[PDB]
């Protein structure tokens, strides 16, 4: 990432206001709903048949909180994402077999979710800093693929 | 293709945009310029400064075209033919940029329509913007 | 939209492929796995090793469907419905990958049909694979 | 880029067999033909109305060799394509207004041309290494865009 200091502060201020539990559930559900193909990985989660079925599925909510948990950690090591995400990268590749393009889709969904949540507070320039950040994370998560 | 559900979602959300379409179009351009700087290569002739009248003027134009696609949701390919011709033959915008704008259009609506921007409406708006993009790029080759 | 020249071009080119389509299927897959290692995420159950019977077998299958599409260049949507089905609802391959296999298929054709891989044929084949791609990812949502 | 000595050798040796003049004129013309919108930057070149007209245009041909030339000089700095292409990156941004996405198209066109030319010699493993270089070059060229 190429985060100016003022971008780094704006990322962090806002992130301070986020309820990772909820945002996490929202981003993951929205991903499964907007890009139905990403459902391939959660066939054991049950019913993902309709939007209410996904958004309210306790398994989706739980997972989402896990994912965003790992993401917030990443936000504290913005200096060493590849480092921070190495073991997870290996897992996604080698055990899970998740196509890394899925990580960029999640990034975009999350940026819509933050826009959804903060309204006007999510200014043009705050989004530019977050774009850099989600791109960074997706890259980090894909770094170990082979 | 857009389902009846999708069409209802889009008309409803765009319905709410109403008279702000102009301002929301301008906003989507600004976000796009800031987040995906590579898109600026297409507007070398524009004052891209904050609150450029050029951008404002340009945003209305875009918004007006989207409003026109919603109005003709069952005949987009024809309702948009002109603009397809323009983008393919004169402007020659590379395809990938369309997805960048779509994404910022999505961001703007989310930021302004908290109540209407449900998972279902989000999915519908995404498919819609993808279809518009497909039309504008249909005459490329 | 394939023009009459395009369909001709495509038909010509594939015509020369002939008894080798299977081999070219296989080779393209091999080139994709090597060049875009992320594509391997969709074949965890295959032996991706050089000259694996699984890859060969699969290469055939892909070649044959391509063949079938050249034959129904005019009615693609209809000729590949099952395949559009399979990929959309069963396989759920992400759309980006279709561009990766397409490219590897060009490369393979380039490497084996020196004389027939003119700039005009190259453009036609590209548009063809794109069309096949669109068809195969049309029921995604 | 992140080329293995083995991969470094394969790139290096195939290249040594490259007639820059021909490959360059052909990479650039195929680009203008396969992806017609790239012609917006060569209005002044003339008649690009037909494959035959692009392939024949000497302005096109001579631009192609100037492009492959710089590309060629870059394979000598695989350890720093960024510093090698910095000024060219500023130029493409600031003076030419060329969308970096075009860098990627060219790259792919380039790989198709090498295959075209080297048939058998251009094996899956050799293409793999060239794919990493074209990505590498495209990335370095886009590096100074703002
Ligand atoms: C921000 C990007 C992501 C982060 C930080 C992240 C993080 C995590 C974490 C911490 C786990 C649990 C690890 C374990 O079980 O040992 C996990 C599991 C998993 N992730 Fe990711 N993830 C991300 C994106 C995605 C996406 C986009 C997909 C699929 C579209 C995905 C698919 C999975 C699956 C299928 C599992 C295992 C679920 C199970 O327990 O069955 N992840 N992820
Ligand atoms: C869904 C997406 C899009 C819509 C609805 C749209 C619509 C329009 C409209 C209505 C105009 C004005 C034409 C006139 O003067 O009547 C225009 C012009 C233009 N558009 Fe698009 N467009 C879209 C995507 C894009 C993208 C993605 C780019 C580049 C990133 C782009 C670049 C341009 C340029 C450079 C002009 C001409 C500006 C000028 O000099 O005034 N367009 N577009
Ligand atoms: C050029 C476009 C493509 C065509 C014509 C095509 C065609 C086919 C065919 C004919 C089959 C076999 C169906 C059967 O067994 O009856 C198949 C299966 C499959 N395809 Fe596609 N395919 C294409 C693109 C892709 C891409 C890009 C990917 C992934 C990156 C992919 C992944 C798969 C997988 C994983 C299978 C099942 C493999 C197995 O378990 O045997 N396909 N495809
Ligand atoms: C491998 C990628 C590329 C390299 C190494 C490269 C390199 C060069 C070089 C060395 C010049 C010389 C101009 C000068 O020094 O003033 C040049 C000019 C130029 N390039 Fe690139 N280029 C690349 C890709 C592209 C692409 C893909 C396009 C458009 C599709 C493009 C458009 C131009 C234009 C319009 C000029 C100016 C030519 C003129 O003055 O007539 N370049 N490039």
XYZ file of C-alpha atoms and ligand atoms in Angstrom:
746
model
C 0.000 0.000 0.000
C 0.832 3.662 -0.645
C -0.889 5.260 2.300
C -0.040 8.862 3.090
C -0.050 9.571 6.834
C -3.289 11.523 6.452
C -4.813 8.503 4.678
C -3.633 6.248 7.500
C -5.255 8.463 10.094
C -8.499 8.692 8.194
C -8.573 4.904 7.852
C -8.026 4.466 11.556
C -10.401 7.154 12.789
C -13.305 5.662 10.917
C -12.408 2.092 11.738
C -12.714 3.193 15.324
C -16.439 3.646 14.747
C -17.088 0.244 13.190
C -18.909 -2.610 14.877
C -16.886 -5.488 13.430
C -19.515 -7.980 14.501
C -22.216 -6.382 12.380
C -20.159 -4.985 9.464
C -18.584 -8.431 9.131
C -21.984 -10.193 8.830
C -23.186 -7.517 6.399
C -20.176 -7.712 4.111
C -20.152 -11.475 3.909
C -23.889 -11.798 3.410
C -23.847 -9.111 0.694
C -21.044 -10.907 -1.113
C -23.030 -14.169 -1.225
C -26.088 -12.271 -2.479
C -24.454 -9.936 -5.041
C -22.011 -12.562 -6.472
C -23.878 -15.813 -5.956
C -20.970 -17.719 -7.379
C -19.079 -17.099 -4.132
C -21.574 -19.459 -2.434
C -19.623 -22.414 -3.774
C -17.483 -22.349 -0.636
C -20.279 -22.413 1.950
C -22.467 -25.332 0.962
C -22.316 -26.547 4.594
C -23.791 -23.287 5.890
C -27.241 -24.369 4.769
C -29.946 -22.269 3.212
C -28.614 -19.395 1.105
C -31.647 -19.562 -1.232
C -32.821 -15.959 -0.811
C -31.389 -12.728 0.539
C -33.161 -13.111 3.906
C -31.876 -16.644 4.071
C -28.254 -15.479 3.710
C -28.257 -12.214 5.668
C -29.906 -13.889 8.654
C -28.057 -17.238 8.554
C -26.255 -17.480 11.906
C -23.370 -19.276 10.203
C -22.865 -16.449 7.699
C -22.962 -13.895 10.513
C -20.449 -15.817 12.599
C -18.031 -16.341 9.703
C -18.267 -12.740 8.665
C -17.213 -11.667 12.156
C -14.252 -14.048 11.922
C -13.186 -12.623 8.521
C -13.535 -8.996 9.588
C -11.731 -9.904 12.824
C -8.717 -11.036 10.832
C -9.132 -7.869 8.745
C -9.057 -5.483 11.712
C -5.822 -7.163 12.815
C -4.440 -6.365 9.350
C -5.358 -2.735 9.931
C -2.842 -2.574 12.812
C 0.009 -3.928 10.696
C -0.563 -1.851 7.551
C 3.225 -1.916 7.269
C 3.402 -5.673 7.010
C 0.287 -7.125 5.413
C 2.079 -9.883 3.572
C 3.604 -10.835 6.868
C 0.391 -10.584 8.827
C -1.574 -12.613 6.295
C 0.900 -15.318 5.332
C -0.562 -18.257 7.217
C -4.122 -17.333 6.119
C -2.919 -16.949 2.532
C -1.490 -20.482 2.665
C -4.751 -21.824 4.101
C -7.052 -20.215 1.507
C -4.892 -21.606 -1.257
C -3.888 -25.057 -0.012
C -6.826 -26.133 2.055
C -9.794 -24.027 1.064
C -8.964 -23.499 -2.635
C -10.585 -20.073 -2.758
C -9.953 -18.173 -5.968
C -8.220 -14.956 -4.897
C -10.424 -12.799 -7.087
C -13.061 -13.419 -4.329
C -10.879 -11.302 -2.005
C -11.198 -8.257 -4.285
C -14.997 -8.688 -4.540
C -15.197 -8.780 -0.747
C -13.097 -5.616 -0.711
C -15.629 -3.771 -2.888
C -18.634 -5.036 -0.934
C -17.008 -3.829 2.286
C -16.483 -0.319 0.772
C -20.184 -0.272 -0.163
C -21.021 -1.361 3.430
C -18.895 1.382 4.966
C -20.608 3.810 2.575
C -23.926 2.396 3.653
C -23.086 2.868 7.332
C -21.325 6.259 7.480
C -23.207 8.099 4.790
C -21.598 11.493 4.188
C -18.789 10.640 6.582
C -17.424 8.335 3.916
C -15.974 11.188 1.795
C -14.439 10.779 -1.651
C -10.951 10.862 -0.132
C -11.831 8.484 2.720
C -12.952 5.987 0.120
C -9.617 6.395 -1.820
C -7.687 5.420 1.336
C -9.984 2.395 1.947
C -9.638 1.325 -1.729
C -5.859 1.213 -1.202
C -6.386 -0.763 1.990
C -8.727 -3.447 0.670
C -6.461 -3.829 -2.390
C -3.515 -4.292 -0.055
C -5.289 -7.009 1.940
C -6.494 -8.921 -1.124
C -2.911 -8.818 -2.479
C -1.536 -10.035 0.847
C -4.086 -12.871 0.908
C -3.154 -13.912 -2.562
C 0.600 -13.587 -2.052
C 1.188 -17.227 -1.083
C -0.849 -18.807 -3.874
C 1.071 -21.171 -6.099
C -30.680 -9.969 -18.029
C -32.805 -8.040 -15.579
C -35.642 -9.930 -13.880
C -39.000 -8.291 -13.030
C -37.671 -8.152 -9.463
C -34.523 -6.369 -10.585
C -36.636 -3.893 -12.610
C -38.813 -3.122 -9.615
C -35.757 -2.628 -7.426
C -34.029 -0.294 -9.865
C -37.070 1.926 -10.566
C -37.695 2.136 -6.861
C -34.132 3.101 -5.808
C -33.589 5.385 -8.826
C -37.049 6.779 -8.069
C -35.655 8.033 -4.730
C -32.615 9.541 -6.408
C -35.084 11.900 -8.037
C -33.745 15.421 -8.354
C -30.380 14.551 -6.813
C -29.333 12.369 -9.752
C -27.278 15.289 -11.006
C -25.371 15.765 -7.769
C -24.976 12.038 -7.279
C -23.470 11.682 -10.804
C -20.919 14.409 -10.079
C -20.106 12.732 -6.787
C -19.571 9.344 -8.411
C -17.100 10.990 -10.834
C -15.152 12.619 -7.979
C -14.925 9.360 -6.051
C -13.717 7.623 -9.264
C -11.040 10.262 -9.887
C -9.738 9.932 -6.321
C -9.797 6.153 -6.012
C -8.912 5.115 -9.576
C -6.657 7.881 -10.846
C -6.032 6.056 -14.074
C -9.521 7.143 -15.200
C -8.353 10.745 -15.377
C -6.453 9.974 -18.616
C -9.832 10.323 -20.355
C -10.484 13.838 -19.030
C -7.227 15.649 -19.759
C -9.356 18.615 -20.875
C -11.205 18.972 -17.564
C -10.665 21.063 -14.491
C -10.783 18.077 -12.063
C -10.542 20.389 -9.085
C -12.986 20.016 -6.230
C -16.288 21.467 -7.338
C -15.259 21.881 -10.934
C -18.270 23.146 -12.906
C -17.006 20.800 -15.620
C -17.392 17.777 -13.366
C -20.780 19.088 -12.157
C -21.868 19.530 -15.736
C -20.506 16.136 -16.619
C -22.221 14.461 -13.664
C -25.645 15.695 -14.806
C -25.057 14.344 -18.256
C -24.234 10.895 -16.884
C -27.098 10.946 -14.435
C -29.487 12.022 -17.236
C -28.327 9.060 -19.295
C -28.861 6.639 -16.413
C -32.312 8.101 -15.746
C -33.045 7.500 -19.423
C -32.000 3.862 -19.179
C -34.345 3.314 -16.170
C -37.178 4.973 -18.158
C -36.552 2.461 -20.943
C -35.554 -0.543 -18.857
C -37.216 -2.838 -21.472
C -35.360 -1.288 -24.476
C -31.943 -0.137 -23.222
C -29.970 -1.233 -26.291
C -32.094 1.155 -28.373
C -32.555 3.879 -25.726
C -28.750 3.983 -25.451
C -27.650 3.276 -29.078
C -26.358 6.846 -29.553
C -24.196 6.809 -26.469
C -22.910 3.319 -27.388
C -21.846 4.693 -30.796
C -20.165 7.655 -29.123
C -18.172 5.653 -26.587
C -17.126 3.024 -29.194
C -16.217 5.373 -32.054
C -15.125 8.735 -30.644
C -14.240 8.503 -26.938
C -12.900 4.953 -27.138
C -12.999 4.336 -23.372
C -11.379 0.957 -22.555
C -13.901 -1.462 -21.155
C -12.475 -1.891 -17.704
C -13.192 1.676 -16.834
C -16.957 1.079 -16.949
C -16.701 -1.283 -14.000
C -14.803 1.421 -12.092
C -17.601 3.954 -12.547
C -20.315 1.396 -11.799
C -18.567 0.704 -8.535
C -18.394 4.378 -7.579
C -22.073 4.882 -8.606
C -22.848 2.031 -6.180
C -20.819 3.721 -3.429
C -22.666 7.038 -3.865
C -26.171 5.531 -3.753
C -25.230 3.513 -0.651
C -24.012 6.714 0.955
C -27.265 8.478 0.157
C -29.961 5.800 0.336
C -29.384 3.979 3.618
C -32.968 2.793 3.801
C -33.344 1.635 0.225
C -29.862 0.131 -0.234
C -30.755 -3.364 0.867
C -28.901 -6.492 -0.129
C -31.556 -7.164 -2.723
C -31.518 -3.618 -4.155
C -27.672 -3.678 -4.176
C -27.663 -6.860 -6.279
C -30.276 -5.394 -8.663
C -28.399 -2.091 -9.059
C -25.189 -4.009 -9.725
C -26.759 -6.124 -12.449
C -28.341 -2.939 -13.873
C -25.071 -1.035 -14.041
C -23.445 -4.097 -15.582
C -26.079 -4.146 -18.354
C -25.689 -0.409 -19.068
C -21.918 -0.994 -19.302
C -22.482 -3.929 -21.674
C -24.573 -1.770 -23.964
C -22.082 1.146 -24.068
C -19.347 -1.299 -24.959
C -21.297 -3.410 -27.419
C -20.104 -1.577 -30.540
C -16.392 -1.721 -29.669
C -15.530 -4.352 -32.301
C -21.408 -9.705 -32.092
C -19.686 -11.924 -34.611
C -19.732 -10.453 -38.101
C -19.911 -12.678 -41.172
C -16.143 -12.295 -41.710
C -15.542 -13.323 -38.098
C -17.603 -16.495 -38.362
C -15.758 -17.326 -41.569
C -12.387 -16.615 -40.027
C -13.266 -18.748 -36.980
C -14.591 -21.591 -39.113
C -11.462 -21.511 -41.264
C -9.046 -21.566 -38.340
C -10.824 -24.271 -36.353
C -11.089 -26.204 -39.579
C -7.255 -26.569 -39.567
C -7.242 -27.571 -35.868
C -8.956 -30.780 -36.877
C -7.832 -34.016 -35.312
C -5.634 -32.014 -32.936
C -8.296 -30.005 -31.050
C -8.055 -32.382 -28.076
C -4.276 -31.904 -27.882
C -4.669 -28.148 -28.126
C -7.401 -28.299 -25.444
C -4.929 -30.118 -23.163
C -2.072 -27.755 -24.023
C -4.064 -24.634 -23.332
C -5.095 -25.956 -19.925
C -1.462 -26.730 -19.241
C -0.470 -23.210 -20.179
C -3.224 -21.732 -18.007
C -2.252 -23.752 -14.929
C 1.338 -22.655 -15.292
C 0.798 -18.992 -16.130
C -2.222 -18.272 -13.922
C -1.705 -20.537 -10.925
C -4.941 -19.259 -9.310
C -6.939 -21.117 -11.950
C -5.798 -24.327 -10.262
C -8.152 -23.566 -7.364
C -10.950 -25.067 -9.489
C -9.268 -28.436 -10.024
C -8.110 -29.596 -6.580
C -9.317 -33.072 -7.519
C -7.221 -33.402 -10.652
C -3.579 -34.421 -11.080
C -2.209 -31.215 -12.657
C 1.125 -32.789 -13.425
C 2.488 -32.648 -16.948
C 0.606 -34.921 -19.301
C -1.839 -36.099 -16.624
C -4.600 -38.228 -18.097
C -7.031 -36.015 -16.191
C -5.830 -32.898 -17.952
C -5.716 -34.640 -21.294
C -9.161 -36.036 -20.859
C -10.511 -32.629 -19.876
C -8.727 -30.934 -22.754
C -10.696 -33.132 -25.126
C -13.953 -32.164 -23.484
C -13.169 -28.455 -23.786
C -12.012 -28.810 -27.359
C -15.169 -30.711 -28.364
C -17.434 -28.016 -26.891
C -15.502 -25.325 -28.743
C -16.021 -27.320 -31.921
C -19.698 -27.579 -31.156
C -19.849 -23.785 -30.744
C -18.085 -23.127 -34.111
C -20.701 -25.379 -35.714
C -23.461 -23.364 -33.973
C -21.645 -20.043 -34.255
C -25.086 -18.760 -35.198
C -26.982 -20.273 -32.189
C -24.400 -20.327 -29.417
C -26.756 -19.458 -26.609
C -28.737 -22.459 -27.592
C -25.901 -24.795 -28.428
C -24.241 -24.286 -24.989
C -27.274 -23.964 -22.641
C -26.319 -27.049 -20.630
C -22.766 -25.813 -20.314
C -24.014 -22.342 -19.254
C -26.112 -24.192 -16.715
C -23.291 -26.356 -15.397
C -20.854 -23.455 -14.953
C -23.424 -21.042 -13.448
C -25.161 -23.392 -11.005
C -22.730 -26.259 -10.490
C -19.088 -25.196 -11.057
C -19.451 -21.548 -10.218
C -16.224 -20.604 -11.897
C -15.535 -16.877 -11.359
C -15.865 -14.888 -14.611
C -12.318 -13.547 -14.573
C -11.033 -17.030 -15.351
C -12.812 -17.196 -18.650
C -10.416 -14.479 -19.931
C -7.425 -16.538 -18.777
C -8.348 -19.748 -20.594
C -9.357 -17.675 -23.656
C -5.895 -16.057 -23.825
C -4.092 -19.403 -23.351
C -6.201 -20.806 -26.186
C -5.056 -17.998 -28.496
C -1.433 -18.558 -27.543
C -1.813 -22.283 -28.312
C -3.410 -21.617 -31.657
C -0.737 -19.049 -32.456
C 1.996 -21.578 -31.725
C 0.434 -24.241 -33.910
C -1.211 -22.443 -36.859
C 1.531 -20.044 -37.907
C 0.170 -19.462 -41.385
C -3.470 -19.063 -40.338
C -2.934 -16.825 -37.303
C -3.126 -13.538 -39.135
C -4.053 -10.306 -37.413
C -7.613 -10.539 -38.772
C -8.010 -14.148 -37.624
C -6.542 -13.257 -34.230
C -9.186 -10.537 -33.752
C -11.988 -12.877 -34.842
C -10.895 -15.758 -32.561
C -10.609 -13.320 -29.616
C -14.146 -12.006 -30.183
C -15.306 -15.624 -30.518
C -13.834 -16.758 -27.231
C -15.298 -13.629 -25.659
C -18.712 -14.578 -27.022
C -18.337 -18.113 -25.729
C -17.333 -16.565 -22.390
C -20.407 -14.343 -22.257
C -22.656 -17.301 -23.052
C -21.040 -19.478 -20.412
C -21.388 -16.812 -17.691
C -24.799 -15.464 -18.704
C -26.898 -17.383 -16.090
C -24.682 -16.390 -13.179
C -27.247 -14.084 -11.697
C 10.358 -9.506 -11.495
C 10.257 -12.501 -9.113
C 11.919 -14.686 -11.678
C 13.740 -17.860 -10.771
C 17.263 -18.048 -12.185
C 15.863 -20.831 -14.348
C 13.025 -18.567 -15.529
C 15.538 -15.763 -15.902
C 17.542 -17.899 -18.328
C 14.556 -18.936 -20.473
C 13.463 -15.339 -20.922
C 17.017 -14.201 -21.631
C 17.798 -16.857 -24.250
C 14.553 -16.711 -26.286
C 14.895 -12.958 -26.448
C 18.401 -13.255 -27.895
C 16.661 -14.881 -30.866
C 14.225 -11.949 -31.287
C 14.188 -9.711 -34.338
C 12.981 -6.630 -32.466
C 12.072 -4.859 -35.682
C 9.541 -7.404 -36.814
C 8.115 -8.460 -33.461
C 7.680 -4.841 -32.390
C 5.822 -3.762 -35.542
C 3.658 -6.880 -35.271
C 2.905 -6.550 -31.497
C 1.855 -2.935 -31.973
C -0.252 -3.580 -35.083
C -1.994 -6.608 -33.604
C -2.878 -4.392 -30.661
C -4.567 -1.762 -32.897
C -6.419 -4.524 -34.701
C -7.562 -6.810 -31.831
C -8.391 -3.935 -29.469
C -9.559 -1.174 -31.776
C -9.948 1.416 -29.049
C -6.139 1.677 -28.636
C -6.124 3.586 -31.948
C -7.258 6.702 -30.119
C -3.598 7.478 -29.453
C -2.394 7.094 -33.027
C -4.812 9.331 -34.969
C -1.885 11.082 -36.612
C -0.498 7.806 -37.947
C -3.064 7.656 -40.749
C -5.181 4.841 -42.161
C -5.863 2.170 -39.535
C -9.196 1.326 -41.203
C -8.034 -2.179 -41.968
C -5.825 -4.927 -40.593
C -3.941 -4.531 -43.892
C -3.648 -0.754 -43.372
C -2.333 -1.028 -39.797
C 0.024 -3.889 -40.474
C 1.340 -1.876 -43.449
C 1.537 1.581 -41.800
C 5.245 2.307 -41.313
C 4.480 4.875 -38.643
C 3.002 1.938 -36.758
C 5.926 -0.283 -37.573
C 8.469 2.265 -36.470
C 6.553 2.961 -33.267
C 6.534 -0.780 -32.590
C 10.335 -1.036 -32.724
C 10.727 1.985 -30.425
C 8.349 0.292 -27.967
C 10.079 -3.145 -28.091
C 13.364 -1.305 -27.908
C 12.581 0.133 -24.467
C 11.013 -3.153 -23.499
C 14.245 -4.830 -24.604
C 16.418 -2.505 -22.535
C 14.172 -3.326 -19.521
C 15.021 -7.075 -19.486
C 18.509 -5.935 -18.516
C 17.032 -4.484 -15.333
C 14.609 -7.239 -14.225
C 15.671 -6.414 -10.669
C 14.340 -2.878 -10.989
C 11.792 -2.351 -13.740
C 10.441 0.408 -11.512
C 13.539 2.647 -11.680
C 14.085 1.599 -15.256
C 10.649 2.897 -16.392
C 10.048 5.837 -14.022
C 10.411 8.675 -16.572
C 8.529 6.683 -19.249
C 5.767 6.151 -16.656
C 5.580 9.873 -15.923
C 5.535 10.566 -19.623
C 2.731 8.129 -20.416
C 0.682 9.609 -17.598
C 1.490 13.324 -17.748
C 2.067 13.772 -21.469
C 0.415 10.930 -23.386
C -2.633 10.231 -21.174
C -2.401 6.541 -21.910
C -4.553 4.289 -19.721
C -2.248 1.734 -18.078
C -4.720 -0.956 -18.907
C -3.305 -0.736 -22.441
C 0.055 -1.866 -20.983
C -1.516 -5.179 -20.099
C -3.191 -5.610 -23.465
C 0.104 -5.065 -25.200
C 1.799 -7.559 -22.942
C -0.681 -10.232 -23.919
C -0.432 -9.327 -27.584
C 3.368 -9.608 -27.201
C 3.059 -13.170 -25.794
C 0.781 -14.187 -28.711
C 3.365 -12.843 -31.176
C 6.265 -14.757 -29.549
C 4.217 -17.939 -29.682
C 3.369 -17.175 -33.285
C 7.009 -16.788 -34.069
C 8.652 -19.558 -31.964
C 6.037 -22.297 -32.239
C 7.448 -25.284 -30.421
C 10.152 -23.265 -28.622
C 7.562 -21.234 -26.718
C 6.583 -23.927 -24.185
C 4.146 -23.579 -21.274
C 7.042 -23.025 -18.861
C 8.586 -20.407 -21.179
C 5.222 -18.618 -21.612
C 4.836 -18.672 -17.764
C 8.093 -16.731 -17.351
C 7.167 -14.249 -20.106
C 3.780 -13.674 -18.494
C 5.600 -12.621 -15.347
C 7.765 -10.152 -17.278
C 4.940 -8.507 -19.237
C 3.032 -8.142 -15.965
C 6.161 -6.785 -14.382
C 6.729 -4.228 -17.161
C 3.052 -3.140 -17.219
C 3.222 -2.610 -13.465
C 6.388 -0.555 -13.661
C 4.969 1.596 -16.429
C 1.824 2.431 -14.462
C 3.741 3.014 -11.260
C 4.009 6.844 -11.511
C 0.390 7.540 -12.511
C -1.398 9.976 -10.189
C -10.723 -10.054 3.819
C -10.552 -11.256 3.218
C -10.629 -12.496 4.139
C -10.127 -12.720 5.356
C -9.282 -11.742 6.218
C -10.522 -14.046 5.756
C -10.246 -14.675 6.953
C -10.624 -15.960 7.295
C -10.403 -16.632 8.568
C -9.704 -15.956 9.755
C -10.879 -17.864 8.467
C -10.897 -19.091 9.418
C -9.590 -19.872 9.403
C -9.566 -21.262 9.935
O -10.629 -21.908 9.796
O -8.515 -21.736 10.416
C -11.401 -18.031 7.118
C -11.972 -19.205 6.687
C -12.593 -19.313 5.481
N -12.602 -18.356 4.476
Fe -11.654 -16.586 4.475
N -11.251 -14.648 4.723
C -11.339 -13.682 3.733
C -12.041 -13.802 2.548
C -12.736 -14.900 2.113
C -13.568 -14.996 0.941
C -13.837 -13.797 0.012
C -13.971 -16.261 0.840
C -14.860 -16.986 -0.190
C -15.500 -16.301 -1.133
C -13.423 -16.980 1.984
C -13.618 -18.324 2.236
C -13.331 -18.937 3.427
C -13.794 -20.247 3.820
C -14.644 -21.158 2.901
C -13.337 -20.472 5.052
C -13.517 -21.703 5.975
C -14.961 -21.795 6.495
C -15.274 -23.011 7.307
O -14.900 -22.991 8.506
O -15.850 -23.953 6.703
N -12.672 -16.124 2.760
N -11.241 -16.853 6.433
C -22.394 3.803 -17.230
C -21.434 4.601 -17.551
C -21.454 5.819 -18.466
C -22.432 6.636 -18.860
C -23.931 6.591 -18.544
C -21.853 7.676 -19.687
C -22.534 8.701 -20.315
C -21.966 9.773 -20.984
C -22.668 10.904 -21.525
C -24.200 11.065 -21.405
C -21.766 11.727 -22.049
C -21.936 13.073 -22.777
C -22.094 12.957 -24.321
C -22.728 14.223 -24.893
O -21.980 15.234 -24.939
O -23.939 14.138 -25.228
C -20.463 11.140 -21.870
C -19.268 11.675 -22.301
C -18.003 11.218 -21.948
N -17.746 10.053 -21.266
Fe -19.130 8.660 -20.718
N -20.488 7.452 -19.814
C -20.221 6.328 -19.041
C -18.957 5.782 -18.860
C -17.746 6.441 -19.097
C -16.473 6.092 -18.530
C -16.276 4.885 -17.600
C -15.583 6.978 -18.959
C -14.075 7.059 -18.643
C -13.593 6.648 -17.463
C -16.267 7.918 -19.822
C -15.670 8.980 -20.491
C -16.363 9.975 -21.140
C -15.763 11.130 -21.781
C -14.244 11.393 -21.843
C -16.760 11.861 -22.283
C -16.691 13.200 -23.070
C -16.506 14.377 -22.152
C -16.460 15.753 -22.707
O -15.417 16.078 -23.323
O -17.457 16.476 -22.461
N -17.611 7.566 -19.896
N -20.598 9.944 -21.207
C -13.491 -21.641 -22.915
C -14.541 -21.684 -22.053
C -14.894 -23.060 -21.422
C -15.469 -24.115 -21.995
C -15.976 -24.332 -23.442
C -15.559 -25.161 -20.993
C -16.100 -26.408 -21.234
C -16.214 -27.378 -20.271
C -16.647 -28.731 -20.542
C -17.010 -29.183 -21.964
C -16.650 -29.390 -19.386
C -17.052 -30.852 -19.112
C -18.562 -31.023 -18.878
C -18.934 -32.479 -18.683
O -18.154 -33.141 -17.943
O -19.940 -32.882 -19.302
C -16.211 -28.484 -18.352
C -16.073 -28.769 -17.009
C -15.377 -28.011 -16.095
N -14.938 -26.721 -16.336
Fe -15.309 -25.606 -17.954
N -15.052 -24.699 -19.798
C -14.639 -23.402 -20.032
C -14.057 -22.549 -19.107
C -13.716 -22.944 -17.829
C -12.826 -22.210 -16.942
C -12.164 -20.859 -17.275
C -12.710 -22.919 -15.811
C -11.900 -22.642 -14.535
C -10.887 -21.790 -14.468
C -13.528 -24.112 -15.969
C -13.703 -25.085 -15.025
C -14.301 -26.300 -15.162
C -14.295 -27.377 -14.208
C -13.663 -27.266 -12.800
C -14.951 -28.395 -14.779
C -15.232 -29.781 -14.176
C -13.941 -30.620 -14.111
C -14.182 -32.039 -13.702
O -14.495 -32.198 -12.500
O -14.052 -32.904 -14.592
N -14.136 -24.109 -17.202
N -15.961 -27.245 -18.919
C 5.500 -2.285 -23.075
C 4.874 -1.138 -22.954
C 5.353 0.185 -23.574
C 6.573 0.721 -23.638
C 7.913 0.147 -23.123
C 6.468 2.004 -24.279
C 7.511 2.852 -24.568
C 7.449 4.017 -25.296
C 8.575 4.827 -25.722
C 10.034 4.425 -25.442
C 8.093 5.901 -26.350
C 8.881 7.050 -26.994
C 8.296 8.455 -26.926
C 9.211 9.503 -26.349
O 10.240 9.087 -25.750
O 8.880 10.709 -26.508
C 6.657 5.799 -26.350
C 5.750 6.698 -26.862
C 4.374 6.541 -26.953
N 3.655 5.463 -26.469
Fe 4.374 3.979 -25.301
N 5.148 2.245 -24.619
C 4.445 1.134 -24.172
C 3.078 0.962 -24.328
C 2.199 1.831 -24.963
C 0.834 1.539 -25.315
C 0.139 0.192 -25.057
C 0.328 2.634 -25.905
C -1.079 2.858 -26.502
C -1.882 1.810 -26.784
C 1.388 3.631 -25.942
C 1.276 4.886 -26.497
C 2.336 5.709 -26.804
C 2.243 6.966 -27.522
C 0.936 7.568 -28.046
C 3.462 7.475 -27.573
C 3.944 8.767 -28.268
C 4.410 8.510 -29.720
C 4.542 9.760 -30.544
O 5.146 10.743 -30.027
O 4.018 9.710 -31.681
N 2.529 3.107 -25.375
N 6.271 4.636 -25.676
